[PDB]
Structure formats: structure tokens, C-alpha cells
Short mmCIF file of N, CA and C and ligand atoms in Angstrom, two decimals:
data_model
loop_
_atom_site.label_atom_id
_atom_site.label_comp_id
_atom_site.label_asym_id
_atom_site.label_seq_id
_atom_site.Cartn_x
_atom_site.Cartn_y
_atom_site.Cartn_z
N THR B 11 67.69 120.47 168.06
CA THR B 11 68.05 121.27 166.89
C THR B 11 68.72 120.41 165.84
N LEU B 12 69.50 119.42 166.28
CA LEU B 12 70.07 118.44 165.36
C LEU B 12 68.99 117.84 164.46
N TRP B 13 67.90 117.39 165.05
CA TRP B 13 66.84 116.78 164.27
C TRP B 13 66.07 117.78 163.42
N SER B 14 66.06 119.05 163.79
CA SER B 14 65.41 120.05 162.94
C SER B 14 66.14 120.24 161.62
N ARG B 15 67.35 119.71 161.49
CA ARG B 15 68.09 119.78 160.24
C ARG B 15 67.59 118.77 159.22
N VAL B 16 66.92 117.73 159.67
CA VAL B 16 66.46 116.66 158.79
C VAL B 16 65.12 117.11 158.21
N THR B 17 65.06 117.23 156.88
CA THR B 17 63.99 117.91 156.18
C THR B 17 63.45 117.03 155.07
N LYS B 18 62.13 116.96 154.96
CA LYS B 18 61.52 116.16 153.90
C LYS B 18 61.85 116.79 152.57
N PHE B 19 62.24 115.95 151.60
CA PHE B 19 62.74 116.47 150.34
C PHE B 19 62.54 115.43 149.26
N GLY B 20 61.84 115.78 148.19
CA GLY B 20 61.62 114.82 147.13
C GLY B 20 60.97 113.56 147.67
N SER B 21 61.50 112.41 147.26
CA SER B 21 61.01 111.12 147.73
C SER B 21 61.69 110.63 149.00
N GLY B 22 62.42 111.49 149.70
CA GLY B 22 63.09 111.12 150.92
C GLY B 22 63.29 112.31 151.82
N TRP B 23 64.54 112.49 152.23
CA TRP B 23 64.93 113.52 153.17
C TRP B 23 66.26 114.11 152.74
N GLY B 24 66.60 115.25 153.33
CA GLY B 24 67.96 115.71 153.29
C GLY B 24 68.31 116.37 154.61
N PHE B 25 69.48 116.99 154.67
CA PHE B 25 70.03 117.45 155.94
C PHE B 25 70.71 118.79 155.75
N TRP B 26 70.35 119.76 156.59
CA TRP B 26 71.03 121.05 156.62
C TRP B 26 72.30 120.94 157.47
N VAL B 27 73.45 121.03 156.80
CA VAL B 27 74.76 121.10 157.44
C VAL B 27 74.96 122.46 158.07
N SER B 28 74.37 123.50 157.47
CA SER B 28 74.55 124.87 157.92
C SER B 28 73.42 125.68 157.33
N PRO B 29 73.36 126.98 157.58
CA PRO B 29 72.28 127.76 156.98
C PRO B 29 72.26 127.74 155.47
N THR B 30 73.37 127.42 154.81
CA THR B 30 73.44 127.48 153.37
C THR B 30 73.73 126.15 152.68
N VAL B 31 73.99 125.08 153.40
CA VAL B 31 74.43 123.82 152.79
C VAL B 31 73.45 122.73 153.17
N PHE B 32 72.91 122.06 152.15
CA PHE B 32 71.95 120.97 152.29
C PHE B 32 72.48 119.78 151.51
N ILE B 33 72.44 118.61 152.14
CA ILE B 33 72.90 117.39 151.51
C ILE B 33 71.76 116.37 151.46
N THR B 34 71.82 115.51 150.44
CA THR B 34 70.83 114.46 150.27
C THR B 34 71.41 113.39 149.35
N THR B 35 70.63 112.35 149.11
CA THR B 35 70.99 111.32 148.15
C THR B 35 70.36 111.66 146.80
N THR B 36 71.14 111.51 145.74
CA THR B 36 70.72 112.01 144.44
C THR B 36 69.38 111.44 144.00
N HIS B 37 69.15 110.15 144.23
CA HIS B 37 67.94 109.56 143.66
C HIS B 37 66.65 110.05 144.30
N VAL B 38 66.70 110.79 145.40
CA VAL B 38 65.46 111.33 145.96
C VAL B 38 65.16 112.74 145.47
N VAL B 39 66.10 113.37 144.78
CA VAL B 39 65.97 114.78 144.39
C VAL B 39 64.92 114.92 143.30
N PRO B 40 64.03 115.91 143.40
CA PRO B 40 63.09 116.16 142.29
C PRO B 40 63.83 116.49 141.01
N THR B 41 63.27 116.06 139.88
CA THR B 41 63.84 116.36 138.58
C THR B 41 62.86 117.16 137.74
N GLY B 42 63.42 117.89 136.77
CA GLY B 42 62.64 118.80 135.96
C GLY B 42 62.02 119.94 136.75
N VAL B 43 62.78 120.57 137.65
CA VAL B 43 62.28 121.68 138.45
C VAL B 43 63.14 122.92 138.21
N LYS B 44 62.54 124.10 138.44
CA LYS B 44 63.19 125.39 138.24
C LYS B 44 63.76 125.97 139.52
N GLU B 45 63.61 125.27 140.64
CA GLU B 45 63.99 125.82 141.92
C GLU B 45 64.05 124.68 142.90
N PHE B 46 64.77 124.91 143.98
CA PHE B 46 64.72 124.05 145.15
C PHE B 46 64.46 124.95 146.34
N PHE B 47 63.48 124.58 147.15
CA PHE B 47 63.13 125.35 148.34
C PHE B 47 62.84 126.81 148.01
N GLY B 48 62.30 127.06 146.82
CA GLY B 48 61.92 128.40 146.44
C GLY B 48 63.04 129.25 145.91
N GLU B 49 64.23 128.74 145.84
CA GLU B 49 65.37 129.49 145.36
C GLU B 49 65.65 129.14 143.90
N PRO B 50 65.96 130.15 143.09
CA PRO B 50 66.26 129.88 141.68
C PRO B 50 67.54 129.07 141.54
N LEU B 51 67.59 128.27 140.48
CA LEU B 51 68.78 127.47 140.23
C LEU B 51 70.02 128.33 140.06
N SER B 52 69.85 129.59 139.64
CA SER B 52 70.94 130.54 139.51
C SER B 52 71.58 130.89 140.85
N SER B 53 70.91 130.60 141.96
CA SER B 53 71.41 130.95 143.28
C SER B 53 71.82 129.72 144.08
N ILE B 54 72.00 128.58 143.42
CA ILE B 54 72.38 127.34 144.09
C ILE B 54 73.54 126.75 143.32
N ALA B 55 74.59 126.38 144.04
CA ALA B 55 75.67 125.59 143.47
C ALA B 55 75.39 124.13 143.82
N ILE B 56 75.17 123.31 142.80
CA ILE B 56 74.75 121.93 142.98
C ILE B 56 75.89 121.03 142.52
N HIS B 57 76.27 120.10 143.38
CA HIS B 57 77.24 119.09 143.01
C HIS B 57 76.63 117.73 143.30
N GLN B 58 76.63 116.86 142.30
CA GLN B 58 76.07 115.53 142.43
C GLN B 58 77.05 114.55 141.82
N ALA B 59 77.36 113.49 142.57
CA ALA B 59 78.19 112.41 142.05
C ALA B 59 78.10 111.24 143.01
N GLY B 60 78.04 110.03 142.45
CA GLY B 60 78.07 108.82 143.27
C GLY B 60 76.92 108.73 144.26
N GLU B 61 75.77 109.29 143.91
CA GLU B 61 74.54 109.31 144.71
C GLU B 61 74.59 110.26 145.90
N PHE B 62 75.61 111.10 146.00
CA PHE B 62 75.66 112.18 146.97
C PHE B 62 75.36 113.49 146.26
N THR B 63 74.40 114.24 146.78
CA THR B 63 74.08 115.57 146.27
C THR B 63 74.31 116.62 147.35
N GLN B 64 75.00 117.70 146.99
CA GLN B 64 75.17 118.84 147.86
C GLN B 64 74.63 120.08 147.17
N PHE B 65 73.81 120.84 147.90
CA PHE B 65 73.32 122.15 147.48
C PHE B 65 73.99 123.21 148.34
N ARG B 66 74.60 124.20 147.72
CA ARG B 66 75.14 125.37 148.43
C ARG B 66 74.34 126.58 147.96
N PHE B 67 73.55 127.14 148.85
CA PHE B 67 72.70 128.27 148.51
C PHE B 67 73.45 129.57 148.74
N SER B 68 73.20 130.56 147.89
CA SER B 68 73.81 131.87 148.14
C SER B 68 73.12 132.60 149.28
N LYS B 69 71.85 132.34 149.52
CA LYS B 69 71.15 133.00 150.61
C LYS B 69 71.09 132.09 151.83
N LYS B 70 71.01 132.71 153.00
CA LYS B 70 70.84 131.97 154.24
C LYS B 70 69.43 131.37 154.28
N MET B 71 69.34 130.06 154.13
CA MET B 71 68.07 129.36 154.06
C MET B 71 67.60 128.89 155.42
N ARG B 72 68.53 128.50 156.28
CA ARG B 72 68.19 127.97 157.60
C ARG B 72 69.00 128.73 158.64
N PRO B 73 68.69 130.02 158.82
CA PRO B 73 69.45 130.85 159.77
C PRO B 73 69.28 130.43 161.21
N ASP B 74 68.28 129.59 161.51
CA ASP B 74 68.09 129.02 162.84
C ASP B 74 69.17 128.02 163.22
N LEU B 75 70.00 127.60 162.27
CA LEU B 75 70.99 126.55 162.49
C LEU B 75 72.41 127.11 162.55
N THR B 76 73.24 126.46 163.34
CA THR B 76 74.68 126.66 163.27
C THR B 76 75.26 125.77 162.18
N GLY B 77 76.50 126.06 161.80
CA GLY B 77 77.22 125.18 160.91
C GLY B 77 77.82 124.02 161.68
N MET B 78 77.78 122.85 161.08
CA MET B 78 78.44 121.71 161.66
C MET B 78 79.41 121.11 160.66
N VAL B 79 80.18 120.16 161.13
CA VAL B 79 81.25 119.59 160.33
C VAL B 79 80.68 118.55 159.40
N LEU B 80 81.00 118.68 158.11
CA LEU B 80 80.70 117.70 157.09
C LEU B 80 82.00 117.07 156.64
N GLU B 81 82.08 115.75 156.74
CA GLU B 81 83.26 115.01 156.32
C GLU B 81 82.85 113.97 155.29
N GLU B 82 83.83 113.57 154.48
CA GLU B 82 83.61 112.66 153.36
C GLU B 82 83.77 111.21 153.82
N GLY B 83 82.78 110.76 154.57
CA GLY B 83 82.80 109.47 155.21
C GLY B 83 83.48 109.50 156.56
N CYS B 84 83.68 108.31 157.10
CA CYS B 84 84.33 108.19 158.40
C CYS B 84 85.25 106.98 158.43
N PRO B 85 86.12 106.87 159.41
CA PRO B 85 87.02 105.72 159.42
C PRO B 85 86.25 104.42 159.59
N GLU B 86 86.79 103.36 158.99
CA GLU B 86 86.23 102.04 159.20
C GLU B 86 86.13 101.77 160.69
N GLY B 87 84.98 101.26 161.11
CA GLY B 87 84.73 100.91 162.49
C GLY B 87 83.97 101.95 163.28
N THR B 88 83.78 103.15 162.73
CA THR B 88 83.02 104.18 163.42
C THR B 88 81.57 103.75 163.57
N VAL B 89 81.01 104.01 164.74
CA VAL B 89 79.58 103.84 164.97
C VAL B 89 78.89 105.16 164.67
N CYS B 90 77.97 105.14 163.72
CA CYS B 90 77.19 106.31 163.38
C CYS B 90 75.74 106.06 163.77
N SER B 91 75.00 107.16 163.84
CA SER B 91 73.55 107.13 163.92
C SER B 91 73.00 107.67 162.61
N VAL B 92 72.05 106.96 162.01
CA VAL B 92 71.34 107.47 160.84
C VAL B 92 70.08 108.13 161.37
N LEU B 93 69.91 109.42 161.09
CA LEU B 93 68.82 110.21 161.70
C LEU B 93 67.60 110.14 160.79
N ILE B 94 66.88 109.04 160.89
CA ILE B 94 65.70 108.81 160.06
C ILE B 94 64.50 109.45 160.75
N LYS B 95 63.75 110.22 159.98
CA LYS B 95 62.43 110.67 160.40
C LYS B 95 61.40 109.96 159.56
N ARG B 96 60.21 109.85 160.10
CA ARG B 96 59.05 109.46 159.33
C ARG B 96 58.13 110.67 159.20
N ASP B 97 57.03 110.51 158.46
CA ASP B 97 56.26 111.68 158.05
C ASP B 97 55.63 112.43 159.22
N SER B 98 55.38 111.77 160.36
CA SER B 98 54.87 112.48 161.53
C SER B 98 55.89 113.46 162.11
N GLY B 99 57.14 113.37 161.68
CA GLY B 99 58.22 114.06 162.35
C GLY B 99 58.87 113.27 163.45
N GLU B 100 58.44 112.02 163.66
CA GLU B 100 59.02 111.18 164.69
C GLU B 100 60.49 110.93 164.38
N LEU B 101 61.26 110.80 165.45
CA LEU B 101 62.72 110.73 165.43
C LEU B 101 63.13 109.29 165.70
N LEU B 102 63.74 108.64 164.69
CA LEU B 102 63.99 107.19 164.71
C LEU B 102 65.43 106.90 164.32
N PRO B 103 66.38 107.11 165.22
CA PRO B 103 67.78 106.89 164.85
C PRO B 103 68.09 105.41 164.69
N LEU B 104 68.98 105.13 163.75
CA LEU B 104 69.43 103.78 163.43
C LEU B 104 70.93 103.73 163.71
N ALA B 105 71.36 102.86 164.63
CA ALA B 105 72.78 102.72 164.92
C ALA B 105 73.44 101.77 163.92
N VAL B 106 74.58 102.17 163.38
CA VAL B 106 75.27 101.42 162.33
C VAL B 106 76.77 101.43 162.63
N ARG B 107 77.43 100.31 162.34
CA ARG B 107 78.87 100.22 162.38
C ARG B 107 79.36 100.29 160.94
N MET B 108 80.23 101.25 160.66
CA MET B 108 80.62 101.56 159.29
C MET B 108 81.83 100.76 158.84
N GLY B 109 81.82 100.40 157.56
CA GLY B 109 82.88 99.64 156.94
C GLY B 109 83.69 100.48 155.98
N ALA B 110 84.13 99.86 154.89
CA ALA B 110 85.07 100.50 153.99
C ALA B 110 84.36 101.30 152.90
N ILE B 111 85.08 102.28 152.37
CA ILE B 111 84.62 103.04 151.22
C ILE B 111 84.74 102.17 149.97
N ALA B 112 83.79 102.34 149.07
CA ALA B 112 83.84 101.68 147.77
C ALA B 112 82.81 102.35 146.89
N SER B 113 82.83 101.97 145.62
CA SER B 113 81.78 102.34 144.68
C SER B 113 81.04 101.08 144.28
N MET B 114 79.73 101.08 144.48
CA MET B 114 78.88 99.91 144.29
C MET B 114 77.73 100.31 143.38
N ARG B 115 77.46 99.50 142.36
CA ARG B 115 76.30 99.73 141.50
C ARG B 115 75.10 99.08 142.17
N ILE B 116 74.09 99.88 142.50
CA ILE B 116 72.90 99.41 143.19
C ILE B 116 71.71 99.85 142.37
N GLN B 117 70.96 98.89 141.84
CA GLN B 117 69.80 99.17 141.01
C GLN B 117 70.12 100.22 139.93
N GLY B 118 71.25 100.01 139.25
CA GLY B 118 71.62 100.80 138.09
C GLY B 118 72.42 102.05 138.37
N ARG B 119 72.48 102.49 139.62
CA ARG B 119 73.18 103.72 139.99
C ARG B 119 74.43 103.38 140.77
N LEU B 120 75.51 104.07 140.44
CA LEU B 120 76.75 103.89 141.18
C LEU B 120 76.67 104.69 142.47
N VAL B 121 76.81 104.00 143.59
CA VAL B 121 76.85 104.64 144.91
C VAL B 121 78.29 104.65 145.37
N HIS B 122 78.85 105.85 145.54
CA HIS B 122 80.17 106.00 146.16
C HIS B 122 79.92 106.22 147.64
N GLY B 123 80.32 105.27 148.47
CA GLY B 123 80.02 105.41 149.86
C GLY B 123 80.60 104.29 150.68
N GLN B 124 79.99 104.13 151.84
CA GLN B 124 80.47 103.21 152.85
C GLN B 124 79.36 102.25 153.19
N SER B 125 79.65 100.95 153.11
CA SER B 125 78.69 100.00 153.64
C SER B 125 78.83 99.97 155.15
N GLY B 126 77.79 99.46 155.80
CA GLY B 126 77.82 99.32 157.24
C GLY B 126 76.83 98.25 157.65
N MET B 127 76.90 97.87 158.91
CA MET B 127 75.99 96.88 159.46
C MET B 127 75.15 97.50 160.57
N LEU B 128 73.87 97.20 160.55
CA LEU B 128 72.97 97.72 161.56
C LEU B 128 73.27 97.07 162.90
N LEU B 129 73.20 97.86 163.97
CA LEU B 129 73.37 97.37 165.33
C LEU B 129 72.02 97.21 166.03
N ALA B 132 65.66 94.29 166.61
CA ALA B 132 64.36 93.83 166.13
C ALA B 132 63.41 95.00 165.97
N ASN B 133 63.63 96.05 166.76
CA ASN B 133 62.80 97.25 166.68
C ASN B 133 62.88 97.88 165.30
N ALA B 134 64.10 98.01 164.77
CA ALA B 134 64.28 98.61 163.45
C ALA B 134 63.49 97.84 162.40
N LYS B 135 63.59 96.51 162.42
CA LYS B 135 62.92 95.69 161.41
C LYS B 135 61.41 95.80 161.54
N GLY B 136 60.90 95.83 162.77
CA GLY B 136 59.47 96.00 162.94
C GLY B 136 58.92 97.21 162.22
N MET B 137 59.74 98.25 162.06
CA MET B 137 59.33 99.50 161.43
C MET B 137 59.92 99.69 160.05
N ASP B 138 60.58 98.67 159.51
CA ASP B 138 61.29 98.77 158.23
C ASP B 138 62.22 99.98 158.19
N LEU B 139 62.91 100.21 159.30
CA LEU B 139 63.71 101.42 159.44
C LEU B 139 64.95 101.32 158.55
N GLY B 140 65.08 102.27 157.63
CA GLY B 140 66.14 102.26 156.65
C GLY B 140 65.85 101.44 155.42
N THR B 141 64.75 100.68 155.42
CA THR B 141 64.48 99.72 154.36
C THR B 141 63.17 100.00 153.63
N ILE B 142 62.77 101.27 153.59
CA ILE B 142 61.68 101.72 152.73
C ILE B 142 62.19 102.90 151.90
N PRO B 143 61.65 103.14 150.72
CA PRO B 143 62.21 104.21 149.87
C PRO B 143 62.19 105.57 150.53
N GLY B 144 61.18 105.86 151.33
CA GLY B 144 61.06 107.18 151.92
C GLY B 144 62.13 107.52 152.93
N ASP B 145 62.95 106.55 153.37
CA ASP B 145 63.97 106.79 154.38
C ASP B 145 65.29 107.29 153.79
N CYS B 146 65.45 107.29 152.48
CA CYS B 146 66.73 107.71 151.94
C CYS B 146 66.94 109.21 152.09
N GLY B 147 68.22 109.59 152.12
CA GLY B 147 68.63 110.95 152.34
C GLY B 147 68.94 111.27 153.78
N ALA B 148 68.55 110.40 154.71
CA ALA B 148 68.80 110.67 156.11
C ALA B 148 70.30 110.69 156.39
N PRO B 149 70.75 111.55 157.30
CA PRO B 149 72.19 111.72 157.49
C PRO B 149 72.78 110.67 158.41
N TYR B 150 74.04 110.33 158.14
CA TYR B 150 74.86 109.51 159.03
C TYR B 150 75.71 110.48 159.84
N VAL B 151 75.58 110.42 161.17
CA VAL B 151 76.29 111.33 162.06
C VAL B 151 77.06 110.56 163.13
N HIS B 152 78.13 111.16 163.61
CA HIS B 152 78.80 110.69 164.81
C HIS B 152 79.26 111.89 165.62
N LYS B 153 79.58 111.65 166.88
CA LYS B 153 79.87 112.71 167.84
C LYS B 153 81.37 112.78 168.08
N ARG B 154 81.90 114.00 168.03
CA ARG B 154 83.31 114.26 168.28
C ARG B 154 83.35 115.27 169.42
N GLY B 155 83.46 114.75 170.64
CA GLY B 155 83.22 115.54 171.82
C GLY B 155 81.72 115.70 171.97
N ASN B 156 81.26 116.95 171.96
CA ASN B 156 79.85 117.26 171.78
C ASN B 156 79.62 117.95 170.44
N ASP B 157 80.62 117.94 169.56
CA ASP B 157 80.48 118.47 168.21
C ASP B 157 80.07 117.35 167.27
N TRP B 158 78.98 117.56 166.57
CA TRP B 158 78.42 116.53 165.70
C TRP B 158 79.05 116.62 164.33
N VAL B 159 79.31 115.46 163.74
CA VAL B 159 79.90 115.34 162.41
C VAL B 159 78.91 114.58 161.54
N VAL B 160 78.59 115.10 160.38
CA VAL B 160 77.81 114.36 159.39
C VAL B 160 78.78 113.87 158.34
N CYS B 161 78.64 112.62 157.96
CA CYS B 161 79.60 112.04 157.04
C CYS B 161 79.01 111.30 155.86
N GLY B 162 77.69 111.24 155.73
CA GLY B 162 77.07 110.62 154.57
C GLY B 162 75.57 110.73 154.65
N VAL B 163 74.92 110.19 153.61
CA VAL B 163 73.47 110.18 153.50
C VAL B 163 73.00 108.78 153.14
N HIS B 164 71.86 108.37 153.69
CA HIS B 164 71.38 107.01 153.48
C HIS B 164 70.98 106.79 152.03
N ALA B 165 71.56 105.77 151.39
CA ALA B 165 71.33 105.52 149.99
C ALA B 165 70.76 104.15 149.69
N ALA B 166 71.05 103.15 150.51
CA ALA B 166 70.68 101.78 150.19
C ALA B 166 70.69 100.94 151.45
N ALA B 167 69.94 99.85 151.42
CA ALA B 167 69.92 98.91 152.53
C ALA B 167 69.25 97.64 152.04
N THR B 168 69.69 96.50 152.57
CA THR B 168 69.13 95.22 152.13
C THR B 168 67.77 94.99 152.76
N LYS B 169 66.97 94.15 152.10
CA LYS B 169 65.62 93.86 152.58
C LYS B 169 65.65 93.44 154.05
N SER B 170 66.66 92.68 154.45
CA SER B 170 66.83 92.26 155.83
C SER B 170 68.02 91.31 155.95
N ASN B 172 71.61 92.65 157.37
CA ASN B 172 71.31 94.00 157.86
C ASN B 172 72.40 94.96 157.45
N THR B 173 72.49 95.16 156.15
CA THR B 173 73.52 95.97 155.53
C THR B 173 72.89 97.27 155.07
N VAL B 174 73.61 98.36 155.28
CA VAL B 174 73.21 99.67 154.80
C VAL B 174 74.37 100.24 154.01
N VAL B 175 74.06 101.24 153.19
CA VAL B 175 75.08 101.98 152.47
C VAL B 175 74.74 103.45 152.60
N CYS B 176 75.73 104.25 153.00
CA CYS B 176 75.58 105.68 152.87
C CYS B 176 76.49 106.21 151.78
N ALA B 177 75.94 107.12 150.99
CA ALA B 177 76.71 107.81 149.98
C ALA B 177 77.56 108.86 150.67
N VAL B 178 78.76 109.04 150.15
CA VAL B 178 79.71 110.01 150.68
C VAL B 178 80.22 110.84 149.52
N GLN B 179 80.57 112.08 149.82
CA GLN B 179 81.01 113.02 148.81
C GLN B 179 82.24 112.50 148.07
C1 LIG C 201 65.90 104.82 149.79
O1 LIG C 201 65.44 105.26 148.53
C2 LIG C 201 66.13 103.29 149.67
C3 LIG C 201 66.48 102.66 151.03
C4 LIG C 201 66.70 101.16 150.95
C5 LIG C 201 65.40 100.36 150.77
O2 LIG C 201 64.34 100.85 150.57
N1 LIG C 201 65.58 98.93 150.87
C6 LIG C 201 64.42 98.05 150.68
C7 LIG C 201 64.47 97.62 149.20
C8 LIG C 201 65.76 96.87 148.96
C9 LIG C 201 66.09 96.63 147.45
C10 LIG C 201 67.54 96.09 147.36
C11 LIG C 201 68.51 97.22 147.71
C12 LIG C 201 69.98 96.80 147.59
C13 LIG C 201 70.48 96.11 146.51
C14 LIG C 201 71.83 95.76 146.47
C15 LIG C 201 72.65 96.10 147.53
C16 LIG C 201 72.13 96.79 148.61
CL1 LIG C 201 73.12 97.26 150.00
C17 LIG C 201 70.80 97.14 148.65
O3 LIG C 201 68.25 98.30 146.83
C18 LIG C 201 68.53 99.61 147.31
O4 LIG C 201 68.83 99.88 148.43
N2 LIG C 201 68.39 100.64 146.30
C19 LIG C 201 68.28 101.99 146.74
C20 LIG C 201 68.14 102.90 145.55
C21 LIG C 201 69.36 102.83 144.61
C22 LIG C 201 69.09 103.66 143.33
C23 LIG C 201 70.69 103.21 145.26
C24 LIG C 201 67.05 102.14 147.64
O5 LIG C 201 66.01 101.56 147.50
N3 LIG C 201 67.22 103.07 148.73
CL1 LIG C 202 72.56 121.24 165.97
CL1 LIG C 203 75.38 106.19 137.82
#
């Protein structure tokens, strides 16, 4: 069910935190549209800053899901999994050790987020390092309660990643 939250969106992915809250990276979001997921813009509260986008829908969009904890990044040193899917729906998690919060200009856009380091398989598949992989969530486990703390925004050709954080 965790992976059923990861949804193809625009030029990447996003993540359902709850039935009404969807997060993604700003640069993958469609532009010049009258709706997202069939809902009018009048029924969505949208907040975008520092390459983090949050949609709060007035209607229950993903009632199949429970709510989980969304936090604004994680402590330095946390090991997260980036829940990358590819177009088949295949599940390809990327393990990352997270570093410090900062704001970094990457290809003209300011990313407010956390850099991290990837922990040969990933490279063979360009995991995290193709445009279609952005928006995937960074998660870690607190007991058996899952915490999402960012969205994939950037990564070097070849092993630093950046997730945008609220
Ligand atoms: C998702 O859209 C994509 C994932 C990262 C990716 O595709 N990397 C392969 C291309 C790498 C180009 C360089 C990197 C970069 C530059 C400087 C610092 C860092 Cl850590 C990474 O460019 C990006 O990652 N740029 C991302 C889009 C920006 C608007 C944030 C990007 O391509 N993300
Ligand atoms: Cl879940
Ligand atoms: Cl910007």
C-alpha cells in the first residue's frame, strides 16, 4: 500500500500522504492546466516553494489510503529510501544517507532541501538520475510508522541526490 501512494504525475511522480494530500517536486507539475486529477483548481489548496509542491484537495481523492506523517526533512544522518517507480509500475527503492538542509540553485531553480549520498545496481538503471524519476518520495521508518520527508528533485550524473523539503 505504501507503493500504491507513488503516482505518475506530469514529467515525474508524486506521493499521496493521505486521501487528500499529494506532494511532488515543482518542476514536474503540469503547467497551464485547469485541474489536477480531475479536480477544479477551486477545490485544491496549492503551495509551492523551493521545488516542493503540496496539493491539499477538498475531496477525498485516495480513500484507499491512510494518512501518514509528513515532516519537513529529516535529521542529518538519517537513512531514507527514495521510492522510485518506473513506468511498468516496478518498485525500485534507492537507499540514501541524508545530509544538511540548504537552498541550492540547480539548473536555474532554487531547491530548498537536503542533499544526500546514495548507498552498482542503481547506476545500471540510472536510478534517480533520469528526469522521469523526480517527485519520488523520501521515506524513513519510525517503528512501523512510515514518515515521508521530501521529494526527489536532483541528482548528479554519477552519487549525490537532493530532495526538496517543505
Ligand atoms: C528529475 O527531474 C531530475 C533527476 C536528476 C537527473 O535526472 N540527473 C541526471 C541529469 C543531471 C544534471 C545535473 C543535475 C545537478 C546539477 C547540480 C547539482 C546537482 Cl545535485 C544535480 O541537474 C539536476 O538534477 N536538475 C534537476 C532539475 C532541476 C530544475 C532541479 C533534475 O534533472 N532532476
Ligand atoms: Cl501505507
Ligand atoms: Cl526559483
